[PDB]
Every structure is written in structure tokens, then in C-alpha cells.
Amino acid sequence: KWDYDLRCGEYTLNLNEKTLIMGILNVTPDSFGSYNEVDAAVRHAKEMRDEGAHIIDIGGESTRVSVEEEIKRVVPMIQAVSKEVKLPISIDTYKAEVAKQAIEAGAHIINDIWGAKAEPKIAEVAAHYDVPIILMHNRDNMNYRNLMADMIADLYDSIKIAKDAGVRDENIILDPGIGFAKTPEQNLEAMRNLEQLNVLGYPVLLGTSRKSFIGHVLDLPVEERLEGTGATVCLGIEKGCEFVRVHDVKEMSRMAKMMDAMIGK
Amino acid sequence: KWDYDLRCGEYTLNLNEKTLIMGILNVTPDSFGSYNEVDAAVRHAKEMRDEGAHIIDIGGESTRVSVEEEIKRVVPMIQAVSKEVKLPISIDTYKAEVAKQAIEAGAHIINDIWGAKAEPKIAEVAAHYDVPIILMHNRDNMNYRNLMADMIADLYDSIKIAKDAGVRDENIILDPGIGFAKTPEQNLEAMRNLEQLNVLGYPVLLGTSRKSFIGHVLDLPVEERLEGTGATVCLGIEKGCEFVRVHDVKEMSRMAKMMDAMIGK
Numbered sequence: 389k390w391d392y393d394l395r396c397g398e399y400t401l402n403l404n405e406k407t408l409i410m411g412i413l414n415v416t417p418d419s420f421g422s423y424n425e426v427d428a429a430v431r432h433a434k435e436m437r438d439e440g441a442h443i444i445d446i447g448g449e450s451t452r453v454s455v456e457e458e459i460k461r462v463v464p465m466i467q468a469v470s471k472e473v474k475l476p477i478s479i480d481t482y483k484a485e486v487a488k489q490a491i492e493a494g495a496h497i498i499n500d501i502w503g504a505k506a507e508p509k510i511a512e513v514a515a516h517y518d519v520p521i522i523l524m525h526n527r528d529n530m531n532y533r534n535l536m537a538d539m540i541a542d543l544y545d546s547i548k549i550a551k552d553a554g555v556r557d558e559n560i561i562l563d564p565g566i567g568f569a570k571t572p573e574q575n576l577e578a579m580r581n582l583e584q585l586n587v588l589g590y591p592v593l594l595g596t597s598r599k600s601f602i603g604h605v606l607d608l609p610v611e612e613r614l615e616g617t618g619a620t621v622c623l624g625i626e627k628g629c630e631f632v633r634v635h636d637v638k639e640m641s642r643m644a645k646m647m648d649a650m651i652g653k
Numbered sequence: 654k655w656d657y658d659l660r661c662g663e664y665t666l667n668l669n670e671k672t673l674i675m676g677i678l679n680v681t682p683d684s685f686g687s688y689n690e691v692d693a694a695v696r697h698a699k700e701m702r703d704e705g706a707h708i709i710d711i712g713g714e715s716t717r718v719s720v721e722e723e724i725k726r727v728v729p730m731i732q733a734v735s736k737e738v739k740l741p742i743s744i745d746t747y748k749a750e751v752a753k754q755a756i757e758a759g760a761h762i763i764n765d766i767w768g769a770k771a772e773p774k775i776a777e778v779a780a781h782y783d784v785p786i787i788l789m790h791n792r793d794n795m796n797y798r799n800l801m802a803d804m805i806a807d808l809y810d811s812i813k814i815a816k817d818a819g820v821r822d823e824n825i826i827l828d829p830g831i832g833f834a835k836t837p838e839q840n841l842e843a844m845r846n847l848e849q850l851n852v853l854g855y856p857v858l859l860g861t862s863r864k865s866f867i868g869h870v871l872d873l874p875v876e877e878r879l880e881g882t883g884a885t886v887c888l889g890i891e892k893g894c895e896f897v898r899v900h901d902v903k904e905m906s907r908m909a910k911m912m913d914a915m916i917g918k
């Protein structure tokens with residue numbers, strides 16, 4: 389099915405062999421590139437490498453921050469993890485300068501929650517270093533004529549921007565952006581119609597880990613969402629996703645792997 | 654989609670509203686209707702009722718037993734649980750006399766792992782008390798020309814037997830019999846083609862809890878199979894199953910419920 393491998397410089401990721409697990413690195417800052425924060429992050433990456441993660445996702449601005457600062461927090465982390473853990477690292481920013489530094493510092497993949505729309509210059513950063521980029525569906529509003537048709541239109545506007553800036557098709561990964569610009573019911577509608585994004589011809593990453601719509605269904609707080617995340621990973625894999633972005637790496641790797649065996653991937 | 658409810662005398666089970674969870678009652682015998690065994694079983698049913706189970710499944714001969722004896726072990730259990738826990742009880746036997754007693758003692762549903770083939774008289778027991786019966790795929794051999802086509806043929810031979818004995822269509826539930834008469838690869842093939850059984854027009858129950866094929870994929874012992882069972886429950890629900898038979902009632906209820914929300918059931 390994929391006629392190419394994901395080229396990540398040093399590392400290569402095969403897209404046919406298994407669902408690829410992206411481990412979410414919790415970047416809990418010190419009040420002050422300090423030791424407790426860089427060391428707590430290195431140990432966390434190591435735990436996830438050992439639990440079956442294939443990519444470590446490192447973020448500077450967690451939604452729940454000055455550009456100069458985001459770099460000083462995230463660059464030390466990427467240096468320590470890329471040196472100490474043999475996994476590709478994706479950098480979770482939408483800012484072009486942050487992306488630029490992160491890749492100099494050793495990150496392999498760009499992870500852009502605004503799909504090259506917040507700062508179009510980021511795809512030029514991608515085009516240049518020639519790295520894979522994740523384009524996530526997002527918009528600053530929630531008025532959908534047709535949810536899926538709109539997601540697909542919007543994603544396609546990211547691809548144009550990326551392709552225009554010089555991004556090769558083989559470095560494009562898409563993401564339905566679950567939990568962004570979507571009501572809880574829209575989130576479950578995007579889950580139920582995820583296979584639609586396959587028509588765009590690109591690999592899909594799904595990020596549903598512990599998100600608020602799981603809580604809305606199950607009526608359960610963020611720490612009781614492991615079964616609900618599992619269900620979303622399972623439906624995602626069955627609908628064709630190539631990657632899942634999760635906190636619970638041990639549990640999701642096992643669910644991923646059993647899905648893979650059953651659907652014949 | 655289902656134009657009728659599952660009639661269980663005292664209780665009624667709706668087939669459209671949610672995936673219905675069947676809790677597996679571990680019937681750990683005393684060396685001797687004793688207290689520790691009937692009381693350990695009542696507390697276990699109660700825990701599962703509280704964790705979200707809709708049916709309690711009670712078995713006399715766990716595969717890993719004289720007819721007269723199977724009754725003396727299982728009849729006290731059904732009396733205590735049906736009196737003390739307000740859930741329908743299914744009786745996991747293939748023996749007609751055991752089924753007969755179990756229903757006198759208070760069980761609602763017959764659960765027959767040999768699909769009325771080991772003892773055809775059991776469907777007459779079903780026909781008479783007018784109870785729902787689960788017909789599970791099983792055979793005393795593993796030489797399949799075409800796995801799915803054979804399962805469907807074999808299941809259909811159970812339906813004939815049941816219908817001939819007087820069983821109403823509305824009291825027939827089918828079960829692909831995962832882990833019986835199937836190699837590990839055949840088990841994963843039946844999972845991947847489960848939606849095929851829907852053409853027979855009946856509700857489907859799936860039993861994959863902690864089974865040996867999960868262990869074969871994940872390489873993990875029976876107590877580390879919770880993620881692997883989850884994956885099977887998720888794929889089952891997406892492929893259309895009306896019931897899942899599980900040990901981990903808390904975890905599987907949550908995964909069931911999140912699947913239901915997403916697939917729109």
C-alpha cells in the first residue's frame with residue numbers, strides 16, 4: 389500500500405509494517421534548560437522507547453508563551469533526547485522559527501497544529517531541511533456547512549501551502565485534528581468518517597489521547613480515559629491511520645499491535 | 654435495526670441502544686452448593702453488575718465432569734445470583750438436562766458452545782421454556798475448505814436444528830466461537846471477517862476475553878491480555894456485534910460505550 393518509506397534522516401519509518409506509535413513527551417517546565425526538566429524529559433522518552441514508541445513528540449506551548457522563550461525551553465530538550473534516545477523526534481510547534489531551531493537542535497519531523505496556516509513560512513522551513521511535516525486540521529471557528537467535506541477542503545488548503553513552498557508529497561502527513569475547532573459531537577462524527585481522509589492520498593496521524601470528547605462520552609476525568617482512548621485508537625487503525633499520538637505508550641502499543649494482526653497490517 | 658427486543662422473562666434487553674456486556678462468572682469450586690463458592694460467586698456477580706454488566710454468564714465445566722454433578726455445582730449458583738442480583742443469567746452448558754435444571758433454578762438464556770450439536774435435545778429445552786439460546790460455532794476438527802464459508806454453513810446447521818425443535822427466530826443469537834476449532838491464524842481471520850455473520854439475520858455475541866490467540870499475537874500470559882481483549886471487543890463492535898463476553902467488565906464496558914458513541918449506536 390505505501391510505495392515508499394518515511395525518510396527521517398537518520399531513521400526510516402515503514403508505513404506498511406505496523407501502526408506507528410507517537411509518544412507524547414510531557415514537557416513540565418522548571419520555574420527557571422535546567423536539569424530537573426531536561427532529566428525528567430529524558431527519562432520519560434526512555435520509558436516510552438521501552439514501552440514501544442516509534443517517535444517522541446516534544447512540545448513547547450501546551451494548550452489548557454513568547455517565541456524566544458519557546459526555543460530556550462524546547463531546544464535543550466531535543467538535544468538531550470535525540471542524543472540519549474534513538475527515536476525520531478517530532479517538534480510540536482506552528483511557529484517557523486521554533487521549527488527551524490528544533491531541527492538544528494536535532495528534531496526530525498515537524499508537527500504543526502495549524503497545518504501551515506498560522507505561519508506559512510513553516511512549510512519553507514520544512515521544504516528546506518526536507519523533513520516530514522504533519523498538517524493538522526484546525527480553524528479559528530466552528531461553523532461547518534459539512535464537517536467532513538470542510539475538513540477535507542481545509543486540509544487540502546494546507547497541502548497547497550506546503551506544496552507551493554516546496555514540500556514533496558512524501559513528506560506530507562495529515563491529521564483530522566480531533567479536539568480542535570470541533571464540538572464534542574463533531575469529534576465523534578470525524579471519528580466515524582475518518583476513512584474519508586484516505587482519499588487525499590496521504591498517511592494519516594490520529595491524536596485522541598485523553599481528550600475532552602472521551603470525557604464527555606464516558607463522563608470521566610483526564611486520568612480515567614485509558615479505555616476511551618483505546619477505543620479511539622482501535623477505530624482509527626481500522627479506518628486506516630498510519631500513526632497514533634498517545635500518552636499511554638505501553639497500553640496503546642499493545643492495542644495497536646493486536647489491531648494490526650487482526651486487520652492484516 | 655433490530656425490530657424486536659430480547660425477551661428474557663423478567664428482564665428485557667434492547668439490541669439497538671448499546672453493546673450488551675456479558676460478565677463471565679468464575680465458578681471456582683470448593684473441594685465439596687457450599688458457602689465459600691456460592692458466596693464468592695454472588696460477590697463476583699455483584700461486582701460485575703456494578704461495573705456495567707448486562708448479563709451474568711454462569712458455567713459448570715470450564716475447559717483448560719459428570720452430568721449429575723454439573724447440576725449440583727451450578728444450580729445453587731443460579732439460585733443465589735438470580736435472587737441477589739437483578740440481571741439476566743445465561744447458563745453456559747451444552748447438556749440438555751443441565752440446561753433444563755438451570756432454567757428451573759432461575760437462568761434466562763442458554764449458552765451452548767456446541768450450537769445444539771452435542772445434544773440436540775437442548776434446543777427442545779429452549780423451545781419449551783421459550784428462552785433465548787446462543788449457538789456458538791464449534792466442530793470436532795479443524796479442516797476448513799473456506800473458513801468463513803464453513804463457519805456460516807456450520808452455524809446454519811445449528812439454526813436448522815434449533816428451528817426444527819421449535820426455537821423462534823427471535824430467540825436465536827449466534828457466536829463465531831473464537832478460540833474453538835480454529836488455529837491462531839484462523840481466529841484472526843474470523844475477527845477480520847466477522848461482519849459476514851450478519852447476513853444470517855441474527856444478533857451476534859463475541860467471546861474473545863483473554864483467549865490464547867491474543868497471547869499468540871502479543872506474546873503475553875492470560876493476566877496481561879486486557880489491551881489485546883480490548884482491541885478484539887472494539888473490532889467486534891465495529892463489525893456489528895450485539896454482545897461481548899468478557900472477564901474485565903469495568904474496562905470493556907468503557908471501551909464498548911466509547912465505541913457505541915463513535916459508530917453511532
Ligand SMILES: C[C@@H]1CNc2nc(N)[nH]c(=O)c2N1
Pocket residue numbers: 451480499500501522524563565566593594595596633
Ligand atoms: C493537543 C495536541 C497538540 N498536538 C497535536 N498534534 C497532532 N499532530 N495531533 C493532535 O491531535 C494534537 N493534539
Ligand SMILES: C[C@@H]1CNc2nc(N)[nH]c(=O)c2N1
Pocket residue numbers: 716745764765766787789828830831858859860861898
Ligand atoms: C471459553 C468460553 C466458553 N463459553 C463461551 N460461550 C460463548 N457464547 N462464546 C465464547 O466465546 C465462549 N468461550
